Ligand binder design. Structure first.
Ligand SMILES: Nc1ncnc2c1ncn2[C@H]1C[C@H](O)[C@@H](COP(=O)(O)OP(=O)(O)OP(=O)(O)O)O1
Ligand SMILES: Nc1ncnc2c1ncn2[C@H]1C[C@H](O)[C@@H](COP(=O)(O)OP(=O)(O)OP(=O)(O)O)O1
Ligand SMILES: Nc1ncnc2c1ncn2[C@H]1C[C@H](O)[C@@H](COP(=O)(O)OP(=O)(O)OP(=O)(O)O)O1
Ligand SMILES: Nc1ncnc2c1ncn2[C@H]1C[C@H](O)[C@@H](COP(=O)(O)OP(=O)(O)OP(=O)(O)O)O1
Ligand SMILES: Cc1cn([C@H]2C[C@H](O)[C@@H](COP(=O)(O)OP(=O)(O)OP(=O)(O)O)O2)c(=O)[nH]c1=O
Ligand SMILES: Cc1cn([C@H]2C[C@H](O)[C@@H](COP(=O)(O)OP(=O)(O)OP(=O)(O)O)O2)c(=O)[nH]c1=O
Ligand SMILES: [Mg+2]
Ligand SMILES: [Mg+2]
Ligand SMILES: [Mg+2]
Ligand SMILES: [Zn+2]
Ligand SMILES: [Zn+2]
Lengths: 698, 699
């Protein structure tokens, strides 16, 4: 009956079931119409029984079982005996194939490297065949094979810290109740982040940190007020309590900030965590925001090194803090100084984001985002969601192999979108194989909003479009340049073509989301591990191509060509169209600047201009420092990294260089990057005219 | 639920699990490890059955899920024995009208670490020299922790020089931090240092004299609070205020240390093995630090007041300081008495006994290891900053069995095995020497080993001149004595002399090796963390069941008195005091079993006072298990599949709370159950004092 579908490892096919009975039977006896009048009744019975019970969907293993009982029911044993011995023998064949026992760096990093090599080796065989071939050939790119599909792994998530900190939780070998202070709250925040980072292969974010940290500031205030009433005179109670509470808040901030920058995971790297704030109204939230900004401004240790993680993310709201008469303008000035001195934080626009996605929430992960979602109770919830997995297309390759023909380009585009849909469905189904006991921090103690049991299934946290899945892309500029040359931003035809590409991607994602009941959204791939393999594996097959492959990298998604130097206003006006057109699952814009430490007004003007147009902005200032000769400014890039342009100094021990790589920053000296990423960073040019040097040097 | 015939029955999760019990039954009798694994598979099927169906469920599709679930969980052996048994019954169940016929419950990082360890072990087994590798595989000796070494030039233990490297500052992760200006910051830095160090090694770690180097930071907090009081509070109360707040802050500085250490884990996926020592403080700050540590351990962990497992607090007893009732620190000793009675921790050390046994006084190293008196070139004696290097274990019962009652043949094989072990130890030290300071900047580059070295330098500077201790393991003195003189040799002077001669020969061989190779070689009573789970099983295959050698399915741990016998602790300690004096000074610990004495610490105080002069390291075990379903605390009956409450029969770890001392570090059964070999050791333990083993029954 049409009312029932079928789920593969597609519509129900009585012929497909009828073929299974026949092909097994022919192992021992020839086909003869003397017994086929019975086998047809056998296949009809197994169809009429499936229809009577299951109405939504059926797995393949249940199709096999529902036949085996029916074969035994109709007094048949000759072929059923042969039926089982092949189905079982094949079942261990696929499991034994995907078996581990099928045989100047930190020690944990080496052990994780070997484990990841083994995991990639088993997962490549675990993957379905055609998607594996596409990934190997380079048509598409699976993401982070070193952990999936070998183990059920979620890409990145928005940790619900409010839920845990409300009613306590359990971590490690201990279980704890709700914190009764602010320093305790920050310590638990850091410990929880560290524990979560080892149970997933991506970043994490703490949205509205001040909003859910305010009650513990109130608790500290009450404790200090009681202590003052006991000890100090009845005239200076309020002043002493407020001063002690402020000092405790700032101290807790320092602790957390430093705790994140120290703890690592099995990978041996600092977790890719980030924080967001800016919606505070009362006094405690304002003090918390001031403490965060000040502790980021101060530095990292005795040398006042630039902090890399967590990635702070500000929030600009009209009426809250946008204009000089706004009640939180001082916080905005502090954030401006922090941005011009430490390249952080990134500013978010309340109205633009709430219009684009559906509800304001901090970008969880590197640059990912979530649409507005409500549960059965009608209350909107943002913290507690997650992204299962990501794969990325190869738009420049499709553009290049099209030989300048648009219709053929669209045909191969549809083919690749189908391949990517199959990959995404497999990734979702593999993730759905997780169990709460696999990670009690995530699925058992409120990391996802709900607290299930080992008796329950994890799919309750993913269905009804609660959990998003991102399909990535890269190199829209190269795609347009294939057909319209290097300079096409002044042409409406190429811009319309790119917008149509994004719109087709969005429409396919919407159709898939409606079909599979998971929010399939497009995604701006951050080129974390994409261009390094993509450029070389495409230049091996297509050769050197002018302005498309000779750069030795791929332009990230839809941003303006980094080789060009337009004014930031022009760049933002050009770029505002893509997120509006459907590129809403993840996006971030960049703006280069000279040293603006003595002139932060330009950044304020840019933020005010970008508030209405874009919903996400990032600054790129030359804040590199060389302690040997007290140099401050930019660094000249070479194939061996960077060096100070006064002494040739290059060792990471006495130099400080950070550059924005993929949403996050990174220090290339302490961790060298791939050559493609290095070429991409070097090719970057400044946007507004100014001297990129603060202190000349000794 | 729809039965095969029909009708309606309730869905019981026990019926699903009981079948899987018979599944693995045909292949292997129920074991504690397989108990959780079997119920791990039983947890997936119960989750899936209710997911697919809503109103009715019959049997011939649940049998499909469990058939599928076993395959999906890599357990083919149970599945291979399931399907054939499953398929057999339905065929016979069929009846014609006339004539018929004629793995998934572990953490992600845990699984990844398991895979990495398997790869490392496979590489290391071929990295070894031939004869030592063959001896290890044959069960002749044990090369400890092949998972991490010699694949990586690891290190066994490390006495983190917390004082100096905290005072001078250090760089961890991506952040360089200076000296702390508060005790809370100091304890946070200590916790992160411990976590990083444990991540950079395959063994335990400890912090000795924590109060001694934590006093200055408490003084700094006191000074800051005094400065604040001089500006806020009135005059006559000022100093008093500066006390109270400080007394609170120190408490917090310990409270975090109780949780952070418990929470943070290494790449292995388990809490790092770590311990703390104290007791030598004299001034007010050190006294308050010790009181805070004891109080936070007493209070418990979390809302359920669960017993803490780590770190292992280790008290220190000194005559004229904290021993006699007239001593200035007798209240601290009484608090330690209560805490040890109610929490199995801390253990004790004798200042004079230890300082005369191992040259100087130092906290025991990691699990049970020890160091020896040592002075650097400048002549200043240094204790913290040294490190152990590696451990291998001898199979004494194998030598005893191959002797067949001939002492001279026993000595011949003993010398042969000593030569093999010396070759193994030299190879392990040489492999470790191949490390580079950049391999772990926390250890070799930032003061965690004492000296600080640059990248372009060799690690041998931190190991040579007998600085780094290197230890050789042994186990089963009671078994080798009973092979010759019967299982009741405790009253025979000749057998005791024979065992002491064995220990003396080992000590002399270690001394000669240390003289030759310029590394301190010391015999070390290895803890049976997994040795008896492997040594005994491999021995019982080659030699069969022997009379009170292998029938017990375990090996007696080093020189300890026979576990089956129950002598009063005074005679037990009198008997056991001779072995460490004979030369077994590299590592040891003396256990002591008591009934529930919560309202009677006087017996424990008397035992400690008696053992201060004779024994240098004592650990008391008292049943402190407690379950919350029926609210009973006391002892537990060691059933085959772990443990259960004697009253309500509860087993679930989410409600029960049982702690047992498993070779130095008290473990957590029902959390990570141990091998069946060790479970027999715990079950066979007795109580060395007459008294009730229960405290308060259930409801
Ligand atoms: N579209 C379908 N409708 C109903 N049953 C199906 C359908 N496809 C497969 N089945 C059932 C019939 C058999 O009992 C069982 C195996 O059929 P099969 O086509 O081999 O699936 P499959 O996923 O293994 O494809 P293949 O074997 O080519 O990899 O699955
Ligand atoms: N040799 C055989 N003897 C009896 N029945 C068989 C035999 N081969 C196949 N069948 C039946 C049972 C199988 O479920 C069905 C489909 O065949 P087949 O695709 O080869 O196995 P499978 O569907 O379980 O996995 P896969 O197709 O991917 O190998 O036809
Ligand atoms: N009433 C039930 N509730 C839940 N599961 C059941 C129930 N009855 C049987 N099962 C499941 C548990 C096992 O996975 C599988 C086989 O168990 P089994 O005890 O042999 O069933 P059964 O019907 O044969 O009982 P019996 O042999 O006493 O009649 O069926
Ligand atoms: N000896 C065994 N070895 C391995 N698995 C077994 C063994 N005995 C039983 N099992 C498994 C498979 C059985 O389906 C299940 C329940 O046992 P059993 O009751 O004997 O068969 P059954 O319940 O499926 O049919 P029935 O109720 O008619 O006996 O447990
Ligand atoms: C990681 C961590 C957890 N916790 C847990 C332990 C407790 O279960 C929970 C309660 O935190 P607290 O607020 O410290 O509870 P308290 O009873 O000690 O109150 P006060 O400090 O004012 O005397 O927080 C800490 O206290 N400190 C830490 O560093
Ligand atoms: C991980 C961690 C580091 N640190 C670092 C920060 C400093 O570099 C060093 C000294 O500790 P601090 O006492 O914080 O130094 P300070 O200059 O901020 O003085 P105060 O807090 O009294 O105002 O320890 C912490 O303070 N807390 C932490 O949790
Ligand atoms: Mg098939
Ligand atoms: Mg039965
Ligand atoms: Mg507290
Ligand atoms: Zn310079
Ligand atoms: Zn009970």
């Amino acid at each position: 009956n049409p009312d029932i579908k079928v789920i593969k490892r597609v519509t129900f096919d009585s012929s497909k079931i009828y073929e299974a009975i026949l092909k097994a039977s022919e192992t021992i006896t020839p086909i003869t119409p003397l017994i086929e009048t019975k086998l047809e009744g056998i296949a009809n019975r197994v169809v009429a029984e499936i229809n009577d019970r299951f109405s939504h969907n059926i797995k393949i293993y249940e199709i096999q079982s529902i036949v085996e009982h029916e074969l035994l029911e109709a007094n048949e044993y000759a072929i059923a005996q042969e039926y089982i011995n092949y189905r079982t023998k094949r079942d261990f064949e696929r499991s034994q194939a995907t078996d581990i026992n099928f045989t100047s760096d930190l020690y944990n990093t080496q052990r994780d490297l070997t484990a990841g090599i083994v995991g990639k080796s088993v997962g490549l065989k675990m993957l379905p065949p055609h998607v594996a071939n596409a990934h190997q050939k380079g048509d598409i790119h699976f993401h982070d094979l070193d952990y999936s599909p070998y183990t059920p792994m979620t890409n990145c998530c928005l940790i619900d810290f409010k839920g845990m900190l409300a009613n306590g939780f359990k971590i490690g070998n201990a279980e704890v109740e709700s914190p009764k202070s602010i320093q305790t709250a920050t310590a638990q925040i850091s410990q929880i982040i560290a524990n979560v980072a080892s149970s997933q292969y991506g970043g994490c974010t703490a949205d509205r940190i001040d909003e859910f940290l305010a009650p513990y500031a109130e608790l500290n205030y009450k404790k200090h007020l009681a202590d003052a009433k006991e000890w100090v005179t009845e005239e200076k109670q309020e002043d002493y309590a407020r001063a002690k509470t402020r000092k405790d808040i700032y101290d807790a901030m320092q602790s957390l900030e430093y705790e994140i920058n120290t703890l690592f995971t099995s990978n041996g790297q600092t977790p890719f965590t980030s924080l967001g704030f800016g919606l505070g109204t009362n006094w405690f939230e304002r003090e918390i925001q001031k403490a965060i900004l000040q502790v980021r401004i101060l530095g990292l240790g005795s040398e006042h090194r630039t902090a890399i993680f967590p990635k702070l993310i500000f929030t600009l709201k009209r009426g809250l803090n946008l204009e000089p008469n706004s009640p939180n303008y001082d916080i905005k000035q502090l954030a401006l100084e922090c941005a011009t001195k430490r390249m952080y934080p990134d500013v978010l626009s309340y109205d633009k984001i709430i219009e684009l996605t559906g509800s304001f929430k901090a970008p969880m992960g590197c640059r990912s985002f979530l649409q507005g979602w409500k549960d059965e109770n009608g209350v909107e919830v943002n913290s507690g969601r997650m992204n299962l997995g990501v794969v990325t297309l190869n738009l420049p390759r499709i553009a290049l192999e099209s030989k300048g023909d648009q219709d053929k380009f669209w045909e191969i585009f549809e083919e690749r979108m189908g391949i990517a849909k199959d990959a995404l469905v497999y990734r979702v189904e593999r993730v759905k194989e997780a169990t709460p006991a696999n990670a009690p921090i995530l699925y058992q103690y409120g990391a996802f909003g709900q607290r299930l049991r080992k008796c329950d299934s994890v799919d309750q946290l993913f269905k009804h479009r609660r959990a998003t899945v991102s399909l990535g892309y890269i190199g829209l500029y190269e795609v347009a340049s294939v057909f319209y040359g290097s300079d096409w931003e002044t042409n409406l035809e190429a811009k319309t073509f790119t917008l149509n590409i994004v719109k087709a991607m969005k429409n396919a994602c919407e159709s898939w989301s409606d079909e599979y009941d998971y929010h399939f959204s497009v995604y701006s791939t951050p080129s974390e591990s994409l261009t390094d393999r993509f450029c070389r594996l495409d230049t091996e097959k297509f050769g050197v191509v002018t302005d498309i492959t000779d750069k030795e990298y791929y332009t990230n998604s839809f941003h303006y060509d980094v080789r060009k130097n337009p004014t930031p206003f022009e760049k933002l006006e050009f770029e505002k169209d893509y997120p509006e057109a459907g590129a809403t699952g993840g996006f971030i814009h960049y703006c280069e600047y000279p040293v603006l430490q003595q002139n932060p007004k330009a950044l304020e003007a840019v933020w005010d201009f970008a508030y209405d147009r874009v919903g996400y902005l990032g600054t790129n200032t030359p804040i590199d420092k060389c302690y040997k000769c007290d140099f401050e400014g930019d660094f000249t890039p070479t194939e061996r990294g960077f060096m100070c342009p006064n002494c040739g100094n290059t060792d990471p021990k006495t130099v400080d260089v950070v550059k924005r790589t993929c949403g996050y920053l990174g220090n290339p000296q302490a961790r060298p990057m791939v050559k493609g990423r290095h070429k991409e960073i070097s090719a970057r040019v400044k946007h507004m005219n100014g001297s990129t040097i603060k202190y000349g040097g000794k």
